[PDB]
Amino acid sequence: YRKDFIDTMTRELYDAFLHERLYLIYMDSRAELKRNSTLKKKFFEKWQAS
Amino acid sequence: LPTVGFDFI
Amino acid sequence: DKESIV
Amino acid sequence: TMDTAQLKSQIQQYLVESGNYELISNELKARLLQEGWVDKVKDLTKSEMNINESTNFTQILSTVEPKALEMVSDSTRETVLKQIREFLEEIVDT
Amino acid sequence: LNSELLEEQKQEIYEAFSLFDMNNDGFLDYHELKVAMKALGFELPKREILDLIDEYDSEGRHLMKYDDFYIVMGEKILKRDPLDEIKRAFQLFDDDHTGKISIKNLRRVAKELGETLTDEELRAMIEEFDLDGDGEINENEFIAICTDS
Ligand SMILES: [Ca+2]
Ligand SMILES: [Ca+2]
Numbered sequence: 001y002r003k004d005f006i007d008t009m010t011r012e013l014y015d016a017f018l019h020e021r022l023y024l025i026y027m028d029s030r031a032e033l034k035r036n037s038t039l040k041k042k043f044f045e046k047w048q049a050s
Numbered sequence: 051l052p053t054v055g056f057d058f059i
Numbered sequence: 060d061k062e063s064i065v
Numbered sequence: 066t067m068d069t070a071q072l073k074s075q076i077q078q079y080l081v082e083s084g085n086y087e088l089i090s091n092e093l094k095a096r097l098l099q100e101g102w103v104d105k106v107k108d109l110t111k112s113e114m115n116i117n118e119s120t121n122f123t124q125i126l127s128t129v130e131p132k133a134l135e136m137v138s139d140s141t142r143e144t145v146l147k148q149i150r151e152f153l154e155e156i157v158d159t
Numbered sequence: 160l161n162s163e164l165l166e167e168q169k170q171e172i173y174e175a176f177s178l179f180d181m182n183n184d185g186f187l188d189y190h191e192l193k194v195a196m197k198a199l200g201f202e203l204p205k206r207e208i209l210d211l212i213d214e215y216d217s218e219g220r221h222l223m224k225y226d227d228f229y230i231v232m233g234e235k236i237l238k239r240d241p242l243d244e245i246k247r248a249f250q251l252f253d254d255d256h257t258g259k260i261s262i263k264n265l266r267r268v269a270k271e272l273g274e275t276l277t278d279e280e281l282r283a284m285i286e287e288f289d290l291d292g293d294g295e296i297n298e299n300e301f302i303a304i305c306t307d308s
Pocket of ligand 1: 179180181182183184185186187188
């Protein structure tokens with residue numbers, strides 16, 4: 001059934017597009033945390049030692 | 051061109 | 060099965 | 066003749082070569098930005114990376130996607146699904 | 160370059176790269192490279208990134224190896240504006256955006272870093288540099304702490 005094949009592929013393709021969006025946002029946010037953790041840790045320790 | 055995040059296959 | 064694309 | 070793996074590999078090669086990969090990807094990220102989806106997902110992802118970042122991953126994404134799937138506006142989801150199906154209808158034979 | 164960078168900064172580079180080296184093969188493609196640099200506080204235009212990859216891309220793979228990443232980021236970290244980092248840090252402490260670092264803020268940061276510190280020790284950290292006597296640290300006071308050298 002061509003329509004069953006197309007509907008399934010449409011659903012799997014949609015999942016992929018969305019998973020990719022999530023993947024990139026996940027990568028983006030993850031960079032933000034490391035950068036934020038690095039800054040806070042640096043300046044906290046600097047503070048705790050002043 | 052498609053990123054690894056694209057899990058179609 | 061037997062499906063054909065382009 | 067053609068098995069599922071071949072068919073899907075062929076569907077994706079054509080999706081990218083036809084340029085429809087970028088058109089759909091772009092349309093989607095534009096619709097998702099319009100409805101503030103990214104920011105909620107950013108907070109969700111950032112909130113879920115917490116309480117404890119356990120830095121070997123990604124078990125967590127499996128939990129975030131479901132609500133994120135539901136969190137997509139019906140307008141965006143239906144619109145994008147319509148584009149995808151349109152591309153497939155043009156490419157599948159018989 | 161080895162002497163110029165602090166032990167803290169060398170680790171910062173190593174961790175940024177490792178976090179996004181998904182294959183664990185010592186290489187980053189464009190996407191992985193973009194966020195790895197963002198992890199070090201560098202947001203570069205797409206064109207500028209392609210130039211960086213291409214400048215060191217011997218193979219034609221369009222990948223960056225760690226040893227080039229280390230040199231490249233190392234130079235950039237030495238060019239960091241000291242005051243901008245401090246102000247950015249302040250905003251991270253002041254997540255509630257009250258314009259001042261409360262004890263709640265400092266305690267929240269202390270928990271994230273897994274610091275074992277008594278409330279009194281935290282209260283003291285504020286008292287020692289609280290110039291207004293408002294029990295909280297504003298931006299200028301925060302800078303004063305970090306600029307002492
Ligand atoms: Ca890699
Ligand atoms: Ca004060």
